[PDB]
Design a protein around this ligand. Structure first.
Ligand SMILES: *[C@@H]1O[C@H](CO)[C@@H](O[C@@H]2O[C@H](CO)[C@@H](O[C@@H]3O[C@H](CO)[C@@H](O)[C@H](O)[C@@H]3O)[C@H](O)[C@H]2NC(C)=O)[C@H](O)[C@H]1NC(C)=O
Ligand SMILES: *[C@@H]1O[C@H](CO)[C@@H](O)[C@H](O)[C@H]1NC(C)=O
Ligand SMILES: *[C@@H]1O[C@H](CO)[C@@H](O)[C@H](O)[C@H]1NC(C)=O
Ligand SMILES: *[C@@H]1O[C@H](CO)[C@@H](O)[C@H](O)[C@H]1NC(C)=O
Lengths: 213, 281, 212, 211
């Protein structure tokens, strides 16, 4: 039983040192070859770590591996972050029963400019579509610096996670990104609940807007 | 295709004799990565015979497969299993990491190391006493200068080709007295009658018109000969059918010639044969 | 150098089976010290591992996708094909073939990777999307685009005014969704002739929708 | 391939003619192109060549011991036996029988060797060991065990407390054994230190207080 956990994104100032951990909260980690990979949008991922304590020859010498905290929680220590290091990362490990477990998405970015707040805009749930027996919601995101953000929905008395769709962010003219979120609901739930809210998770902040009938 | 496989230090020894050796099952079970023969070509196994065939099965690593050969040096090829230089046979080995491994470490397979003398070809040592390596030996208890001779294999998943468990089968061929009785299949063909076919029923090489016969033989008789010691009847070993062996065709052709002094047109004469068995008037 | 050739369709019907192939070019697939694996990339999610296959075919498949994914190597043509059934909106992801080194150490160091085939799954054909206006509360007006399959579908306003647009996402209904928004100085200007327009390339159909 | 194997007595009385043997398997001693030699090696010293014997009666010896050794041969059993007369206490060594190639236009390497048997020479048959301490004068101290017939002897410190030097066959035909410990300071001398030995082949245990 081997499992991992990856944060959404980590960002720091240039020339600093960051740490991204694979979080082996299940099973042993130090008994396998921990691997890290690098992927750009569109192309296939590439190797950035070949051995637990050794880097491959096809990558610049700016990475160091933290295999164990003496109990668990393997990590990766990257020194000398620059603009060319901005890419996606994925943890790679194996279970003792030949079960390969990829950690997940991990985006590293450099804070070359101040982190702008994401703009959020809500709208009524398309009263015409309500007449069409549908109550799908829509949320708008724009003007945020990170390449990807996670979206969450909140109802009047409980959070909403089921039926949530998130669009792939796209770069604007000002080197910023914009995305969108959609929530599928029934007209009875919209008429019963008091209101709903859309919040956008940012690297150090959160912008949230509300909508009510 | 057995389930339980013997260790390398106690390899299996199964005498195979008095049977037909259909080697197609060997090619059908696995892609035979390490298939390499030393006495016979890898395709003529079905065209010859042997007296006794010994199958030796054991599990080793992927890099130790190169040690199974006539004349070698290594952990297995010196203290576990050695082939003689006159080895005439084939070596079959394939990957077996899907069954011979476990996450906690498979311990039922071990290999002997640090033996005081190299084993002779085709030798098996069942003793497992401690290895005395000093003039001040232990009191029978393992420890300093009394190290254990058997070391367990590191069979575990996610391992590489260098350490994954590989099941190896060694087919040694032997020739001695009591002539060969275990050969490969000959792939008998369908019977053809009323044609000048060559027949080889149980080695009876010949040629003749195989026609249905009414000369009923005895249950223990297979061939038939005339006064001239010439075989003229044979039974199909697949059934009780009997076929007469008649001489197909032979006879001196005489060319009737009226003489070139008068004309050039000539004729031929096929003596002793019908006109229906020869290639206007 | 060695490259990985790929082939296979990217559009199938739901609740069916799909078989994708991938051939190693510039070398030989029967070379030892290497496995052969297929890798999935779910949309919006991270990286997902399917399984690797040795030249002997030990069939190391994923435990969560048991009896649903399968790949078999065929060294006779130096190619290996991935197959799976019950394809639907559940995954609708991209698959990548790749090789990995097992040269003594544990399985690691994926050195060669494939191009990738977008496995899109849909039940309905190329049809026009539905447009719904957005009522106002500086105010804003917009239109909601829903249930459109094909990719070449754009949203505009007044046929040339484009105001901002947002990307799409493949929702649970197996179809994408778009949205647009324009800005107005006040909510009293909602009676103007703001017309949000959409188009459908596979049918050359243009739909207009006024947002009062 | 060809391999050899030695066999014979392990301990004999002095001044008696020694005669080992060597079994040839995988090869024929009746074959030409190869000599058949015996190589002795004292414990911790170099190889001392004794002599090689061709199949055609040509027997060679080392000039230092020619008047003692006389190699024989047996073509029927593929064996050859080295006969060494007038053995001494200094002749104890590991005798290896090895084939030497004579086909490369000159005599050449000993391509194949045996396993070697370490023979010993002793005039007695049973004698109990004698213990003697090694009094000290950071410190070190130990005990000395000598004058015992059999080779295997186990020595222990305080029946479990924490080196035992290997045995050595002296001129009198008896072995000797030593043991020593070390302490970081002379203050450790207040503790108890008893040096005991284990003599299995005679069931003997000796105690000696050391300080
Ligand atoms: C050697 O192999 C041949 C080929 O299988 C054997 O011939 C087979 O003999 C059996 C008799 O046990 C035949 O079965 C019988 O067939 C008849 C006609 O179809 C049917 O009426 C009977 O009820 C019975 O089923 C079989 O047909 C026949 N096959 C062929 C192709 O002729 C032969 O018996 C074998 N010889 C020995 C010594 O085992
Ligand atoms: C081997 O034996 C198993 C059962 O032990 C059987 O299922 C299989 O068909 C046999 N043959 C092969 C090639 O695996
Ligand atoms: C046969 O030969 C003789 C002598 O050469 C000749 O005179 C005669 O004409 C020949 N017959 C015919 C039919 O030509
Ligand atoms: C063919 O040979 C048979 C057997 O001798 C004979 O009886 C027959 O007359 C011959 N000719 C024909 C046309 O059958």
């Amino acid at each position: 039983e081997f499992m991992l956990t990856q944060p959404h994104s980590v960002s720091e100032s240039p020339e600093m040192t960051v740490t991204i951990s694979c979080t082996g909260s299940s099973g042993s980690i130090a008994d396998n070859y921990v691997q890290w990979y690098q992927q750009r949008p569109g192309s296939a991922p590439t190797t950035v770590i070949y051995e637990n304590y050794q880097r491959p020859s096809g990558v610049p010498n700016r990475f160091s591996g933290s295999i164990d905290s003496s109990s668990n929680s393997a990590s990766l220590t990257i020194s000398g972050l620059k603009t060319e290091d901005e890419a996606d990362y994925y943890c790679q490990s194996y279970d003792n029963s030949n079960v390969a477990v990829f950690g997940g998405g991990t985006q590293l970015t450099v804070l070359g400019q101040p982190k702008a707040a994401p703009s959020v805009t809500l709208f009524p749930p398309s009263s015409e579509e309500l007449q069409a027996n549908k109550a799908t919601l829509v949320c708008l995101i724009s003007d945020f610096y990170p390449g990807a953000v996670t979206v969450a929905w909140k109802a009047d008395s409980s959070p909403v996670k089921a039926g949530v769709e998130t669009t792939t962010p796209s770069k604007q003219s000002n080197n910023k990104y914009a995305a969108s979120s959609y929530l599928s609901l029934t007209p009875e739930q919209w008429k019963s609940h008091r209101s709903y809210s859309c919040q956008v998770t940012h690297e150090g902040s959160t912008v949230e807007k509300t909508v009510a009938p | 295709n057995a389930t339980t496989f013997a260790s390398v230090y106690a390899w299996n020894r199964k005498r195979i004799s008095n049977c037909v050796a259909d080697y197609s099952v060997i090619y059908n079970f696995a892609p035979f990565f390490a298939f390499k023969c030393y006495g016979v070509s890898p395709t003529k196994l079905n065209d010859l015979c042997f007296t006794n065939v010994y199958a030796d099965s054991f599990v080793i690593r992927g890099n130790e497969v190169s040690q199974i050969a006539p004349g070698q040096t290594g952990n297995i090829a010196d203290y576990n299993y050695k082939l003689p230089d006159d080895f005439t046979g084939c070596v079959i080995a394939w990957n077996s990491n899907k069954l011979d491994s476990k996450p906690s470490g498979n311990y039922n397979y071990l290999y002997r190391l640090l033996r005081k003398s190299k084993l002779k070809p085709f030798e098996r040592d069942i003793s497992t006493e401690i290895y005395q390596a000093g003039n001040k030996p232990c009191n029978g208890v393992a420890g300093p200068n009394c190290y254990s001779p058997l070391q367990s294999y590191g069979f575990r998943p996610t391992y590489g080709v260098g350490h994954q468990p590989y099941r190896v089968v060694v087919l040694s061929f032997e020739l001695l007295h009591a002539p060969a009785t275990v050969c490969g299949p000959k792939k008998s063909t369908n019977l053809v009658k009323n044609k000048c076919v060559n027949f080889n029923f149980n080695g009876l090489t010949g040629t003749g018109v195989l026609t249905e016969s009414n000369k009923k033989f005895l249950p223990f008789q297979q061939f038939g000969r005339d006064i001239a010691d010439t075989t003229d009847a044979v039974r199909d070993p697949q059934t009780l059918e009997i076929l007469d062996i008649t001489p197909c065709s032979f006879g001196g052709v005489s060319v009737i010639t009226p003489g070139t002094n008068t004309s050039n047109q000539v004729a031929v004469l096929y003596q002793g044969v019908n006109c229906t068995e020869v290639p206007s008037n | 150098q060695v490259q990985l050739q790929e082939s296979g369709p990217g559009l199938v019907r739901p609740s069916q089976t799909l078989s994708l192939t991938c051939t190693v070019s510039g070398g030989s697939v029967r070379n030892e010290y290497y496995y052969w694996s297929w890798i999935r990339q779910p949309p919006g999610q991270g990286l997902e591992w399917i399984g690797y296959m040795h030249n002997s075919g030990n069939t190391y498949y994923n435990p969560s996708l048991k009896s649903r994914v399968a790949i078999s190597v065929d060294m006779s043509k130096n190619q290996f094909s991935l197959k799976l059934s019950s394809v639907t909106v559940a995954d609708t992801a991209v698959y990548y073939c790749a090789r990995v080194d097992v040269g003594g150490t544990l399985v690691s160091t994926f050195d060669h990777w494939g191009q990738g085939i977008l496995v899109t799954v849909s039940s309905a054909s190329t049809k026009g999307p539905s447009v719904f206006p957005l009522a106002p509360s500086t105010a804003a007006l917009g239109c909601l685009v829903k249930d459109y399959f094909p990719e070449p579908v754009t949203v505009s306003w007044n046929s040339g005014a484009l105001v901002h647009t947002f990307p799409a996402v493949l929702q649970s209904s197996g179809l994408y969704s778009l949205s647009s928004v324009v800005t107005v100085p006040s909510s009293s200007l909602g009676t103007q002739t703001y017309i949000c327009n959409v188009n459908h390339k596979p049918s050359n159909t243009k739909v207009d929708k006024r947002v009062e």
